Amino acid sequence: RKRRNFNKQATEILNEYFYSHLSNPYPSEEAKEELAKKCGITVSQVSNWFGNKRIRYKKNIGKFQEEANIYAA
Amino acid sequence: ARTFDWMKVLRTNFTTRQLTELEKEFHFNKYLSRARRVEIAATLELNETQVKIWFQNRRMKQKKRERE
DNA sequence: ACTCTATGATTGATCGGCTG
DNA sequence: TCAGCCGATCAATCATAGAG
């Protein structure tokens, strides 16, 4: 099928949340719905983003340090 | 940053023939009896566990469809 | 326009927890 | 005690969009 990316703003919001919870990047059902409403996407798309984010992150930590440094705080 | 705990935590390739038969069964009954499980497995050349897991995953994607 | 990478989605299978 | 299910997640892979 076709794959459509997310807005720059949506990914901006997702990363900020991801790196601000790097010690435990597992949003609860409530947090997920909140992220969905703010990003303009579904809870499923939020769950996939985090699932993909986590796995790819731990697979090559070094590759995302620059990014982690940006959303650090 | 620091490497936290979560950072430290064979995949069957079903044929088109198997997926088609699995679906058919699903649409006949969402849950399978021990009897029908062994039967489908034998017919499809799979283990009961694979059949069991496929049904489990199938039910969940259904839920994720009726909810989206 | 092509090669290589980034990334959203799918899916077989695992993990902790609940239940009969 | 034990197997089946649920909900969440994992891990590998598919197919495409974007970067150089």
- CATH value at residue A41: 1.10.10.60
Task: Give break positions in chain B: residue before each, C–N beyond 2.5 Å.
Answer: 9
Asked if A7 and A39 count as a contact pair (C-beta separation under 8 A), the reply is yes
Give the one of B4, B64, B68 whose C-beta lies nearest to A23's C-beta.
Answer: B4
- With b for 16 or more beta-carbon neighbours within 10 A and e for fewer, the B27-55 pattern comes to eeeeebeeeebeebbeebebeeebbeebb
**Residue type, position B48, single letter:** E
Q: Which residues of B touch A51 (CB under 8 A)?
A: none
**According to the entry, how was the structure determined?**
X-ray
Structural domains of chain B, with CATH: 1-68 (1.10.10.60)
Inform me whether the C-beta atom of residue B6 falls under 8 Å from chain A C-beta atoms.
Answer: yes
Q: Where are the alpha helices (DSSP H) in A21-64?
A: 29-39, 43-59
The answer to whether the beta carbons of residues B55 and B44 sit under 8 Å apart is: no
Resolution in A: 2.3
User: CA B13 – C1' D10 distance (Å)?
Assistant: 17
**A8 Cβ contacts chain D strand, under 7 Å:** no
Q: Which of residues 33-62 of A touch strand D (CB under 7 A)?
A: 47, 50-52, 54-55, 58
Distance CA A2, CA A48 (A): 16
B1 touches chain A (CB under 8 A): yes
Domains contained in chain A, number? 1
In B13-62, DSSP assigns E strands to none
Q: Which of A56, A58, A50, A61 is nearest to A15 (CA)?
A: A50
**Within a 13 Å sphere around the CA of A67, how many CA atoms are in the beta-carbon half?**
16
Q: How is residue B37 written in tokens?
A: 């499980």
> And the tokens for B32?
């399978």
Is there a contact between B22 and B45 (Cβ–Cβ < 8 Å)? no
CB contacts of B3 in chain A (<8 Å) are 61
Print the domain residue range for A7: 1-73
- Give the start-end residues of each E strand in B1-68: none
Cβ separation B6–A24 shorter than 8 A: yes
